[PDB]
Design a binder for this molecule. Structure first.
Ligand SMILES: *[C@@H]1O[C@H](CO[C@@H]2O[C@@H](C)[C@@H](O)[C@@H](O)[C@@H]2O)[C@@H](O[C@@H]2O[C@H](CO)[C@@H](O)[C@H](O)[C@H]2NC(C)=O)[C@H](O)[C@H]1NC(C)=O
Ligand SMILES: *[C@@H]1O[C@H](CO)[C@@H](O)[C@H](O)[C@H]1NC(C)=O
Ligand SMILES: [Ca+2]
Ligand code: NA
Ligand SMILES: [Zn+2]
Ligand SMILES: [Zn+2]
Ligand SMILES: [Zn+2]
Lengths: 175, 212, 212
């Protein structure tokens, strides 16, 4: 299983198309203050991987968390992650929807910031890694075996929507 | 980048269905906000996203639209709904504001009460002479005021002020003021204040001659 | 109970730099600043993404810096170079998401009026207005800072009173007018004195209209 403690991510927005699918993190146990769901775990660490179609007894868009390109002036969804121990991070696998006909496309680029201590600022040197198939592909993001305890991954926008369903990590606990 | 709300004013009575349009310069996402703002007060959030309503805000406020064209239909206009509205595209960052659709109550036309006031003797000591003209209980706001000093029209130095639509009778009031120097005041004789209005069969001329 | 009170409300000279302080009682949200000129609508100034700024405006590209202080829990807005056209009420918005995930500010500030002019704080000059129902009033012609509270008969006469919005004269001073629609029969027996109260210059003028 993913040895993650908590993750910070903006609140899931709603796509109002035909019947209006809700793309919110319904299983988020943490508290959502302002425009951030910080200090908790939800749909991005539940083991359940999203289906090829986000619409498919629950409301349409239950197994997904979304964000629109127009609602982010920065152009990226700043997602933070907190871990229990100082681990060496090999790679991050995220299952995103690639439905081009409804705007939900894979991110154009993902850069991550690393830090070992909770009080110190992000070390630096981000690991940035960069279509017709409309199937949900598990995006492989190489983290270069860097030893860190907290992450700050920014998911760039390529399509009008970014629909993540599950975020997994590959790491070994360093002594 | 640009939010062009239209129209600038809507004249409607209590119970009428009112729809306000908000146009966006670019094909933006579904995110938008609608603010109610009564005069002399701070704004109030009514709608978030497009269709979502804020707590306390009644269900009569309906939201709609996607892309550039956006609307704000009201099930039944209420006496506590009359205020200027503002559409605002608000993402996490750069969020410009709209123009402002001023919702105004609709009532039967009422003729204005015209009163011309000559400059006070204390003001004439310093060297100034501001002739005031009063128009009261006239609806709608639209009324042309003309300052025909010595049989000829004057356009310079004519400030005008309209009070916000009344709470009891919903009537407007205007105070046009022709501020003139004491030197030019002596050169002229008959000061007139003619006004044109919807509730007038002919433009009412209210003038005064030099002397009590 | 959460509050957003900004410590502003200062008159500045064209070219000077004034900084405002949006203190937040009851704290780390997506914060904005929105201004509203008297009569004009709302225009968003800038935004700050938790300690890291985000593009202010097309007009506010030069000057206008939004600093943040977590130790004092207060937003700071330095305006640097200023022009006479920058006079408006400055509010600080607090953007909070609704039940659909989309953003939209729910809590607004109190607002602090900033005046940009070269003129000095001057006291008002009250002049009487010579009168089926007759009209009479006061003229607050020459005074620099806003506002001025005009009362009628020490707060006893309210029916028919219309205190007009202050007009900006060519000299740089404002002009207010307050009139009362009373019956012609009541003129001569009743006494009409307007209690003009001015706080910025520490002045108070109780001027009567036509002593009879
Ligand atoms: C929301 O997305 C639209 C569309 O942009 C597309 O997706 C981007 C991620 C990128 O791949 C673009 O090249 C794509 O076109 C943005 O709107 C466009 O903005 C550009 C800006 O130069 C403009 O030329 C286009 O006409 C706009 N409209 C369309 C239909 O393409 C929009 O800006 C995005 N929102 C934000 C806040 O960035
Ligand atoms: C998610 O959205 C649905 C929409 O019906 C709502 O009922 C649910 O409470 C929401 N859950 C959270 C945690 O936002
Ligand atoms: Ca999941
Ligand atoms: Na973000
Ligand atoms: Zn291993
Ligand atoms: Zn009246
Ligand atoms: Zn809601």
């Amino acid at each position: 299983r993913d040895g993650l403690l908590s993750y910070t991510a903006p609140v899931g927005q709603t796509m109002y198309l035909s019947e209006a699918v809700y793309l919110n993190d319904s299983t988020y146990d943490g508290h959502t203050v302002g425009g951030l769901q910080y200090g908790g775990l939800g749909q991005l660490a539940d083991g359940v991987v999203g289906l090829d179609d986000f619409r498919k007894r629950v409301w349409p868009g239950y197994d997904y968390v979304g964000w629109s390109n127009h609602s982010f002036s920065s152009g990226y969804v700043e997602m933070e992650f907190e871990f229990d121990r100082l681990r060496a991070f090999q790679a991050m696998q995220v299952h995103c929807n690639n439905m081009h006909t409804l705007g939900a496309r894979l991110p154009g680029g993902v850069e991550c910031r690393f830090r070992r201590g909770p009080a110190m600022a992000w070390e630096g040197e981000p690991m940035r890694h960069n279509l017709g198939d409309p199937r949900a592909r598990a995006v492989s993001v190489p983290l270069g075996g860097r030893v860190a305890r907290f992450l700050q991954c920014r998911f760039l926008f390529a399509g009008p929507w970014l629909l993540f369903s599950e975020i997994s990590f590959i790491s070994d606990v360093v002594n | 980048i640009q939010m062009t709300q239209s129209p600038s004013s809507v004249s409607a009575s209590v119970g009428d269905r009112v729809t306000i349009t908000c146009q966006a310069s670019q094909s933006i996402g579904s995110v938008l906000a609608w603010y109610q703002q009564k005069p002399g007060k701070a704004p109030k959030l009514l709608i978030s996203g497009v269709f979502d309503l804020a707590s306390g805000v009644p269900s009569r406020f309906s939201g709609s639209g996607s892309g550039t064209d956006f609307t704000l239909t009201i099930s039944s206009l209420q006496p506590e709904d009359f205020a200027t509205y503002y559409c605002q595209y608000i993402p996490y960052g750069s969020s410009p504001f709209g123009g402002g659709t001023k919702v105004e109550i609709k009532r039967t036309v009422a003729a204005p009460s015209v009163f011309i006031f000559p400059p006070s003797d204390e003001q004439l000591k310093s060297g100034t002479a501001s002739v005031v003209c009063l128009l009261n209980n006239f609806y709608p706001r639209e009324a042309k005021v003309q300052w025909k000093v010595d049989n000829a029209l004057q356009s310079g130095n004519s400030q005008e002020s309209v009070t916000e639509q009344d709470s009891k009778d919903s009537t407007y009031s205007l105070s046009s003021t022709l501020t003139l120097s004491k030197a030019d005041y002596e050169k002229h004789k008959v000061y007139a204040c003619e006004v044109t209005h919807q509730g007038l069969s002919s433009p009412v001329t209210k003038s005064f001659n030099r002397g009590e | 109970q959460v509050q957003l009170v900004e410590s502003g409300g200062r008159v500045v000279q064209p070219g000077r730099s004034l900084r405002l302080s949006c203190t937040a009682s009851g704290n780390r949200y997506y914060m904005l600043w929105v201004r509203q000129a008297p009569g004009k609508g709302l225009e968003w100034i800038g935004t700050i993404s938790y300690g890291d700024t985000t593009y202010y405006a097309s007009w506010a590209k030069g000057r206008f810096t939004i600093s943040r202080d977590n130790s004092k829990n207060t937003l700071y807005l330095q305006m640097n170079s200023l022009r006479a056209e920058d006079t408006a009420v400055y509010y600080c918005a607090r953007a909070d998401t609704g039940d659909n995930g989309y953003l939209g500010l729910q809590l607004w500030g109190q607002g602090t009026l900033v005046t940009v002019s070269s003129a000095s704080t001057k006291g008002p000059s009250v002049f009487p207005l010579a009168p089926g129902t007759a009209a009479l009033g006061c003229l607050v012609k020459d005074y620099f800072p806003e506002p001025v509270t005009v009362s009628w008969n020490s707060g006893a006469l309210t029916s028919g009173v219309h205190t007009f919005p202050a007009v900006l004269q060519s000299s740089g001073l404002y002009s207010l007018s307050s009139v009362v629609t009373v019956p012609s029969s009541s003129l001569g027996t009743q006494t009409y004195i307007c209690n003009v109260n001015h706080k910025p210059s520490n002045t108070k003028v109780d001027k009567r209209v036509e002593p009879k």
